């Protein structure tokens, strides 16, 4: 398991001068959905491109915490689910538009489901169970980069999460607890006057992993004084 | 400590294939790191065949996927290397080595002797 | 894919006289990713410095390494006649994974 986030003090969402809309796009209805596909090419030795296909990009580069993982997956039909830039993003070609993500990279041969676990989750406005809901995937691992964007884009979508100017919430954060190991994520930006999309992204390059029904979500919040 | 020995037939005829053998000492194969062939020409450029890593996995110099192999034994712990259709522009001497990192920084710590292999008629 | 260019092949030095060798490179890398070797003839390659920097086990503090971008060089303080040898700068990242064409150190007499 990894500790609580009191001696991992949190982002404070008006300690960032830049924009937030920077933060919503990235949860808000676009993403990198896709189905059993192949790697067709890599630039670097921790990422692979995928060529695949709504409106700015087509191939997408995908980027990993290792040498390894960009291994294992080249080549393998998998599912590809993760948030994406274009901001900060090239990469060559060696095939004779771009967009580039981290992590989000699922085994898709074994891994189906019929039959679609719900994950429900719990949020805590200054600490009260103050919403629920649930999100859906039809897979036995998920990629919690895939639960987290989901889990956003709904608060956004009707909590205002994230507005554009900064947000209504000081703190933020999304717990995920399996039986015997939970771990969270910081939903609030780097502190100051404008925000790196590859950098906050690059949370998920290791491609963590849960399983479809052993997991419960928590979404921690707080508000400005 | 981690020693590398390469091995194979020190000459190929034109279009014959080219196996060879790294036997590694000292480290289990598949515990950690890549394991990759090397080859350096006369004039010395040294170019990187490709590894089969710590779990059975490959990645290729795109300048040769189509003629390359790389497997390993596990059970006698040793690593190969198999090239097609050679032709003369392919004698060179082989090393095979294991890498280290630190971070997103792979290197090359260990190197095997090395091994000629002249292809010719 | 990459192409990295060493400057020059040889050069002489006279045993003391302190001594630098260039690696530009295409495209271009960070610090982090960017090594030399050493190879003395008959011999295999062994590393020197990785991350640009860094020197490896045993190797004298005479040498060190600065670069960054597409622009990167190894240096040798006193050169004694112990440090012939070829020195090839070599890019991960890439993919291809890249080598320079050495750098031959002779010496001077």
């Known amino acids: 398991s990894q500790p609580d986030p009191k001696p991992d003090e949190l982002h404070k969402s008006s300690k960032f001068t830049g924009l937030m809309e920077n933060m919503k796009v990235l949860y808000d209805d676009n993403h990198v959905s896709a189905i059993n596909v192949k790697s067709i090419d890599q630039f670097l030795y921790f990422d692979l491109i995928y060529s695949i296909k709504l409106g700015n990009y087509d191939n997408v580069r995908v980027e990993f915490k290792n040498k390894d993982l960009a291994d294992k997956y080249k080549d393998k039909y998998v599912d590809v689910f993760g948030a994406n830039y274009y901001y900060q993003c090239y990469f060559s070609k060696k095939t004779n538009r771009k967009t580039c993500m981290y992590g989000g990279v699922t085994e898709h041969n074994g891994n189906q489901l019929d039959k679609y676990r719900s994950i429900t989750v719990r949020v805590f406005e200054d600490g009260k169970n103050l919403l629920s809901f649930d999100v859906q995937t039809n897979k036995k691992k998920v990629t919690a980069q895939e639960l987290d964007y989901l889990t956003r884009h709904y608060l956004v979508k009707n909590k205002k999460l994230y507005e554009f100017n900064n947000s209504p919430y000081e703190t933020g954060y999304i717990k995920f607890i399996e039986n015997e190991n939970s771990f969270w994520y910081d939903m609030m930006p780097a502190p100051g006057d404008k925000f790196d999309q590859s950098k906050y992204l690059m949370m998920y390059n290791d491609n963590k992993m849960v399983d479809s029904k052993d997991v419960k979500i928590e979404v921690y919040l707080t508000t400005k004084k | 400590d981690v020693q590398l020995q390469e091995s194979g037939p020190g000459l190929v005829r034109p279009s014959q294939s080219l196996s060879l053998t790294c036997t590694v000492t000292?480290?289990?194969?598949?515990?950690?790191?890549?394991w990759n062939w090397i080859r350096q020409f006369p004039g010395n450029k040294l170019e990187w065949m490709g590894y089969?890593?710590?779990?059975?996995?490959?990645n290729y110099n795109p300048s040769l996927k189509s003629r390359i192999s790389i497997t390993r034994d596990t059970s006698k712990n040793q690593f190969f290397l198999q090239l097609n259709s050679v032709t003369t522009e392919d004698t060179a001497t082989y090393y095979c080595?294991?890498?280290?990192?630190?971070?997103?920084?792979?290197?090359?710590?260990?190197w095997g002797q090395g091994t000629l292999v002249t292809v010719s008629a | 894919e990459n192409v990295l260019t060493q400057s020059p092949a040889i050069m002489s030095a006279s045993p003391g006289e302190t001594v630098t060798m260039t690696c530009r490179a295409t495209?271009?890398?960070?610090?982090?990713?960017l090594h030399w070797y050493q190879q003395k003839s008959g011999a295999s390659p062994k590393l020197w410095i990785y991350?640009?920097?860094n020197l490896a086990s045993g190797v004298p503090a005479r040498f060190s390494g600065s670069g960054s971008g597409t622009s990167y060089s190894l240096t040798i303080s006193s050169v004694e006649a112990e440090d012939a040898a070829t020195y090839y700068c070599?890019?991960?990242?890439?993919?291809?994974?890249?080598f320079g064409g050495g750098t031959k150190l002779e010496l001077k007499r």
């Open positions: 080595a294991r890498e280290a990192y630190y971070g997103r920084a792979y290197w090359f710590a260990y």
């Open positions: 000292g480290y289990s194969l598949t515990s950690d790191f890549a």
């Open positions: 089969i890593n710590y779990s059975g996995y490959t």
């Open positions: 495209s271009s890398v960070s610090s982090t990713y």
């Open positions: 991350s640009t920097s």
């Open positions: 070599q890019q991960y990242i890439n993919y291809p994974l890249t």
